[PDB]
Symmetry: C4
């Protein structure tokens, strides 16, 4: 029992000396790292092209359909007069009708097939307003039924829409919906696939502020083209190989975990006979490996489905595959732990981690207090403090010494509007930054240094 236990805790070289078994798990893990990384690289290279295609088409659509659009204007693009809004709407519809003659791309029209389109219509120009909308600011009176009514004109591909009359006082928004079909030629070494872009142009008046932002958005539905012919299954084979490798690694790691648990039970029983501590038998690296195996297998199944155009959940698949790749590359640290000079460093980090996490809790409460205060006080005056997540991002960047002067300068242009708020912002920023840079970061350094001293001088 003592000998078996001592064998259970030997290093790979010691195990090889003791029993001579060729280490299959280590070579399997190396092969796993290689194949998982290659799969991720190929997947990312393939996804990059599709992302570029979608983005380029969307930029072209913005230039084609948004009157007076220029690059970099997305956030501020808006209308401010009734004639501006009418001109933008009519320009978008006219450009839709002129597309085959003017566009550098090759687009096919799509008709019908559900709402908001009718059977024969390619473009839907829809206006949404309030059911009852009496508003008289002169007498400070209003009578509103907030129920939204939609009235929408249908345009067939090549002027009734030219008679649009907007209900400005009760207008909620205006939308233009249409679909364009194109073939992704640049895929050529894949076979070109068929894209359907659904384009939505929104003129948004929900704020009722006299400023109506204009935006264009696209959703791309990708399918296989019916009759592809390019003059003159390794990906699937590689996915199968990855799945098989991860399954074998999973089985071996599960067997190791089960044997460890059995030895733990035997040891506990023997000690009870003779007479947190049990987790010593749990190999955390194997738990990490099993988790990465499961993530990789799920992600590869989803990747197979996506590459066949049967699925479109890119986000979840990418998150699974990326997290698993991160996990395997982290697990590479296990190998370095077997050599004394590297183990010194890894053990220092391990012994430091608990106190680092506790201090992280201590820091978290103070940080949250500062976040709330800054959001309530500075949010009305500072673009970086509008929302709580933005406030947290700004404060975290300040801790790391990024974007500090611009944060101060934004407040600089309020010293006359509100002296009290400017003074408060000075105190708030200086105190936060000084406390975190002089004291908190220094304490993290001290914790790591103390851990290192403990490791070096037991």
């Amino acid at each position: 029992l003592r000998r078996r236990l001592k064998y259970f805790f030997m290093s790979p070289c010691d195990k090889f000396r003791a029993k001579g078994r060729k280490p299959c798990k280590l070579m399997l893990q190396v092969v796993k790292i290689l194949v998982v990384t290659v799969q991720l690289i190929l997947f990312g290279l393939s996804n990059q092209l599709a992302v570029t295609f979608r983005e380029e088409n969307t930029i072209a659509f913005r230039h084609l359909f948004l009157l007076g659009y220029s690059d970099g204007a997305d956030d501020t693009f808006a209308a401010y007069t009734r004639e501006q809004l009418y001109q933008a709407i009519f320009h978008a519809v006219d450009q839709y009708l002129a597309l085959p003659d003017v566009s550098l791309g090759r687009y096919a029209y799509v008709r019908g097939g559900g709402d908001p389109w009718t059977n024969g219509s390619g473009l839907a120009l829809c206006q949404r307003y309030y059911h009852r909308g009496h508003v008289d600011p002169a007498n400070d009176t209003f009578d509103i039924d907030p129920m939204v009514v939609t009235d929408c004109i249908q345009v067939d591909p090549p002027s009734s829409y030219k008679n649009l009359t907007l209900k400005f006082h009760k207008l909620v928004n205006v939308t233009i919906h249409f679909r364009l079909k194109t073939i992704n030629l640049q895929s050529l070494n894949e076979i070109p696939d068929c894209y359907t872009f659904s384009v939505l142009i929104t003129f948004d008046n929900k704020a009722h502020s006299g400023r109506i932002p204009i935006s264009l958005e696209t959703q791309a539905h990708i399918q296989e083209c019916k009759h592809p012919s390019v003059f003159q299954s390794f990906r699937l084979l590689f996915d199968v190989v990855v799945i098989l490798t991860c399954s074998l690694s999973f089985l071996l790691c599960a067997r190791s975990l089960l044997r460890g648990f059995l030895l733990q039970n035997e040891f506990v029983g023997f000690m009870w006979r003779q007479r947190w501590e049990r987790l010593e038998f749990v190999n955390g690296w194997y738990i990490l490996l099993v988790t990465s195996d499961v993530l990789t297998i799920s992600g590869t199944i989803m990747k197979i489905g996506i590459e066949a155009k049967n699925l479109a959940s890119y986000d979840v698949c990418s998150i699974l595959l990326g997290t698993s790749t991160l996990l395997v590359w982290v697990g590479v640290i296990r190998y370095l732990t077997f050599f004394h000079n590297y183990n010194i460093l890894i053990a220092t980090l391990r012994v430091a981690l608990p106190s680092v996490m506790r201090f992280c809790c201590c820091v978290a409460v103070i940080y949250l207090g500062y976040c709330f205060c800054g959001w309530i006080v500075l949010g009305p005056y500072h673009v970086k403090f509008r929302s709580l997540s933005m406030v947290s991002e700004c404060l975290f960047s300040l801790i790391n010494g990024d974007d500090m002067f611009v944060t101060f300068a934004a407040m600089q242009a309020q010293q006359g509007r509100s002296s009290l708020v400017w003074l408060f912002s000075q105190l708030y920023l200086y105190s936060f930054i000084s406390l975190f840079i002089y004291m908190v970061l220094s304490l993290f350094i001290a914790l790591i240094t103390g851990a290192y001293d403990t490791i070096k001088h037991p």
Copy 2:
């Protein structure tokens, strides 16, 4: 006396074991944190909408009334010729007269009601110049009576103002004042309130430099609309709940403080009989809690007043509520002090703090010297060094390693204009940054590390 004293200093668990009293203050403080944070979140969410409404309306006004205005041009927007100035003024007035036909918002005119408007006038176009303004640079002569005369034209809502004749040589400024009434519809789940925007357009010639900056500013007066009807008091109840919670906490903390003071007096008297040290009986956490309670109660009273449209002091109320929320979240640290592993870190910070503050004084004198020198020498040549507060912000950012290269690059464009100043700027910046990064920050680290060693090895 020894028993009572030792009880006074026990931890909550020890006190519970000793006397069995259910801890009311701890649960009360947890509930207080919850309710104060929720109140702050609701208040901030409500204020965000009003801020957005005001800002969007002001952006729309800039686009409507400022001839040739574009986003991002606020700081440089100016006129440089007499025809430019006349065109800007006349465009603003014409747009005011055309507003009902062109604007995407719904605005009502406001007439009369005090200065600068006369009884029936909606817009005031006022020109301010010097009483006597003879200026003859050809002979280097001038005869100025600096008393400002105001001549102002009155315009009724739907062209005498077209006959404006500006006294350019003695002109101080030109202003356009008018008020617009609108209803904030997007409040819909509140009831829409009625806004009166007072719009001031300023053409500023106080520098007499040939460049006249143009700006537009708004003040919003919010009130309840007279006849609001939306087809089909929890906030006030929550405010009352917060006030009650804070009052109960205040009473309990005050009782604890008074009992501590009484025990302190008894101990001092007994020691005097037998025979800075007194503050040991003062519970600082309770002083913090009492301060937080007072701030929260004041801020909640102000918040109740504001939400009824009876008050408009958003800045003070927000500062009070935010500071109190920061204080309660900081006071959460007291709970962590009860567990040994967290108390190690908190005690390290506490023991470090005095020396950190002393070194802050030492740093302050040197920092102030650098601020003064940089302001006097570089201010004529560097945008970041124009005022003392700006100089301090720039230097503090440099200490934290932000905005360093742009600070150097601004000086790069003067190596030919003044070699001496460029060389001085090199020495100044390099010496300041090197001194603060190699030595000062390192000493803060050393202070924290020494405190940690003292705590870990008593």
Copy 3:
């Protein structure tokens, strides 16, 4: 001798106890700090207005005289065709002739008074080209006499200049020179002074590259107006007070230094009788104070001269006064050295300084090597690496973690043009940053920590 020596080294409180002399030097130094700081603040506030006036006038000139100018275009403003250049020149001259009718400022013309103007001329339009300039790139031939000929047209204030014929193939540059007189009215609480702006517009063809940059520059000559009359000497009195205070402090510090030297001589002689070490008698704080006094007196004399319009050397005066203010505020540290808890920190810095400077030399050689390498290799491809001073600024900013991603991104757009250079840039940047952040800054921290330990545990 022992008693006198021990008295010479006592602290101010010990000296006061020993002999009872009221400390005049300390109160004098406090008063000096106050008066010098107030003088600097008043000087800077006064110089800010003049700087703003000059800059605003120059911006107005750019908008008035440079065809198609817009804010932020200074660095890229250039002509690229012959008609563009002709139009820019003629627009500048026409605007000069139209100035009284169109400008928002009030400017008087200046005629004659030296070169390049003739007696009756207000504007000089001068063209500089090569004496002999045959250039024939078709046959790869050229015959050039590089001697510069200047031909310049004279324009009187209100079209011979319209017949300008530029020698494009041998053109060196074109310049427009003219002077405008204005009165600085915004000085009103001073008396307005008279400004003469000399305006130089340069069309620069020295690169002969097909691109001719266009710039406008001004020199302002300020004088007192002949007949100033504003309807209804404390600065000079304050300057005299500052000079007197600094002179008294200088005399007292010099007396202290002389007495210290005398005691040093007596001690050395007595030791020689009985039987770097001498500098222990030198009070470094008094050397600093004497330097500050001298700088302040010189700067105040220059300030008096400048404020009377008898001098125009603002740079030297500002450098003197700012450096002296920095020195006095640094000298404030002497007072903190008298209290033990502050002396701990100051002594830590003092004991650390020698090793910090030695490591600075070690760092300097490696830093200079990297600067040379980066300048030679990356300068052809990277805007931040064009000159050696720019390279040093970029590397120093990288050490402090500023502007790092943009430095990488500029190189990103060369991975195709030159793979070798891009790879070298990767190695260069990563190695430099890693070496300086992991090792150098850490060693500075270690030096400070070791000094602190030595001070705390003698």
Copy 4:
């Protein structure tokens, strides 16, 4: 043998005392540093002018030939309609034909001389499309022969090209090729050399996305002009001097290395008679010096060739000379090692280096995992995460606290598009930055501090 060995390891001063030989190598190394640095400075100053000339000419070409071009638009400059593309092409060709009349530079046409030009043609306007290109997105069908056909029109210098008909549906790209000859006059104190700019304007449709980017690129071929005549060999002599100095240093260092090896062999043999450790006889500084000598000699030979216009490999020559200069300036550290106080610091760095490199490996695996995960997950949504090298640059900048807030803000505008991806980005960024700033950098500091303590307290 003991005496000779002890002499081999003495310092220069000890060797001078022991044998009196005047140290030739040290003075030679000082002279080498001086001459190598001067050579590098002169070379860089000369290269700067050529770089500026090429860049200015290219900017002029962009302004002359690209319709509607403005500075800073290089990355987004593109066409979006067929008429836009036709206008850009025709404008470029028309400007080429009008160049002598409109350009501010002096350019000669180049005719024929290889492809794509025919014998008498100066400009080649070439269109590249697919051999067979049927694309019908309406029926989701396509028939493509991806073989590229080039059809190109030839234009002689002063309209057949006006009849260009683009095959938009199968268009791959359009290119305009032409060469211009100019003389670099600003070289005047060199002799002007003759430049041939080959200009390529690309209209790129490889993405087939409806957006066609437009770019202009130049290659400069520099030669000596046939008949240079400027009215009224030190560089080569200096290059020869540098080569001779480096050769002498190489010979002396090689002799020292050989003698060290001989002594090592003798010691090993004697010890074997009596009875990693051998490298103690290897002087690493001499290996560094020999490497720098070789690099300098190669770079100087290439520099001589380049300055004669016989070579054009600026990149390799610059890399060689810059690396050698960096190496000699690093080797300056050897001299500081001879003085005890500097040797303390250098020895601290030397003893720290092995553990620093080991921890660098440990950090590398985790860093690579994060790089892969970020590339796969965020690349579709974040501009900074498009490629792996860009991801690494972004993460490395984040470690150093640069460009943090903008990285967060780019993700901020996806909280609605994909909540899962935004949450993942929050976790990813916060965890990465916290781990590297609290723990990794702290451990580097601890390693350096421990090394320093070991050096200071043996």
